[PDB]
């Protein structure tokens, strides 16, 4: 509980469909982007943690909650964009007379800051009398021991929880999904999807002096104007598709039915024909 592991995985293909065919995970509450639409999503840095808690305490792994493990053992930020996976593990983490190999923190001075691991053992002094190596009224060991007995209902049974913390920021993606790739077509307004950034437009070889550490490029607004190809390391400009307004010149329905169309913003080459200002 207090020594939750963290094995950061990077530079690999993540197929989340494997987790569905495993043991029943009836806690897959993705407090984040999406539980289902997750394979077609590139990530930058995914941090996978692990810990074992009771049954009635799994609801405290949500971003923002009170309790004892969400304030002094393992607290998640309010902007946690990830998925928490838990399942009943009352088949190998329980034993006769209760398992005493899982200790949790009970007493602490202040609330645990987001993503902090407090590996320490000091007698919490709650008041005037300072203790040295004993425990009394104001002194006690802050690490209590869980009692995982195979006798109670599912309210206190051991639950193996694994939380996957995603970043999803403007950085070179390293953990994508099992989605395949296609061939790059530049001179055509098509639908592009580079590392999750969807959209449509014409891609052209830009003469922009992109630095080696820079991947994306934005204009005066927060819109991706240029993106570097993740495979061939080529910088391409993202110009929007051919749009514009349409005006109809109508002399009057009572007079006739002939109408003229005025394509605003076109030079008569991207729609008799007459070019105006």
């Amino acid at each position, epitope marked *: 509980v207090y020594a939750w592991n963290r094995k950061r995985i990077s530079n690999c293909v993540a197929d989340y469909s494997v987790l569905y065919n495993l043991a029943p995970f009836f806690t897959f509450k993705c407090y984040g982007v999406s539980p289902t639409k997750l394979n077609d999503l590139c990530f930058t840095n995914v941090y996978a943690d692990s810990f074992v808690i009771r049954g009635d305490e799994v609801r405290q792994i949500a971003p923002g909650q009170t309790g004892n493990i969400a304030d002094y053992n393992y607290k998640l930020p309010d902007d946690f964009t990830g998925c928490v996976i838990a399942w009943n593990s009352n088949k*190998l*983490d329980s034993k*006769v*007379s209760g*398992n005493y190999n899982y200790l949790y923190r009970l007493f602490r001075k202040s609330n645990l800051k987001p993503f902090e691991r407090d590996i320490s053992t000091e007698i919490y002094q709650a008041g005037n009398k300072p203790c040295n190596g004993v425990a009394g009224f104001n002194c006690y060991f802050p690490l209590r021991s869980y009692s995982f007995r*195979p006798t*109670y209902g599912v309210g206190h049974q051991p639950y193996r929880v694994v939380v996957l913390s995603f970043e999803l920021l403007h950085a070179p993606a390293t953990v994508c999904g099992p989605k395949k790739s296609t061939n790059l077509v530049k001179n055509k307004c098509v639908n592009f999807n580079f590392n999750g950034l969807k959209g449509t437009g014409v891609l052209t070889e830009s003469n922009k002096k992109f630095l080696p550490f820079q991947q994306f490029g934005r204009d005066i607004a927060d819109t991706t104007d240029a993106v570097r190809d993740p495979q061939t390391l080529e910088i391409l400009d993202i110009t929007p598709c051919s749009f514009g307004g349409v005006s109809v010149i109508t002399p009057g329905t009572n007079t006739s039915n002939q109408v003229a169309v005025l394509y605003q913003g076109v030079n008569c080459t991207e729609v008799n024909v007459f070019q105006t200002r």
Partner: antibody
Amino acid sequence: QVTLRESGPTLVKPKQTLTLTCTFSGFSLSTPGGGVGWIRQPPGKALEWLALIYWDDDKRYSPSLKSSLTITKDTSKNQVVLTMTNMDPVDTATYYCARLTAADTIFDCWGQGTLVTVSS
Amino acid sequence: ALTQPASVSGSPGLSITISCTATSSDVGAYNYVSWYQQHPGQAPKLMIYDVSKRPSGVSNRFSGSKSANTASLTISGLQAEDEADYYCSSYTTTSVVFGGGTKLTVLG
């Protein structure tokens, strides 16, 4: 498959310490959730649990008998040894060592049994 | 502990049930309960554990359930090779109880 064979002297002097072993073959005791225990079966009576060991050196014993039951593991040679002191002429029974695969499967595979008749 | 009927009779072909009552159930929720079979002269082998499921190698003749606090073993299609002692075992707060015995006598 799992083969749980027992050994040790069946006949001994009263008021001594038994050395009933349990040579297990076909599985590794270091699996999470596994363990080997001991069940007593008096002649013409029901079963009764005596002791149980786990994969993390945890030694669980019966609450009635704790001053004599001392179990130990020898995974180096795959031979679980059970020792009990203060042998009285009431403990004559066929002992069995069964593997506890997990919490849901309570003693799925059993052994064959060794009768220990020691009164006088 | 756990109490079981002493003698249970059953005609060949019918179905009989066993009773694994509470008897001051310190077991708690009575989640896990396993039933064994011990022929005279052999070793007890597991027939059904976690009564909602059954182990591999056992025919569909054996099934079990637990309505509120009593586990029952439903054995359908009785045969001559079924007269053995059955035991229900659960996890108590400090030990592993094995209950009493139940002798099946298939007449006819």
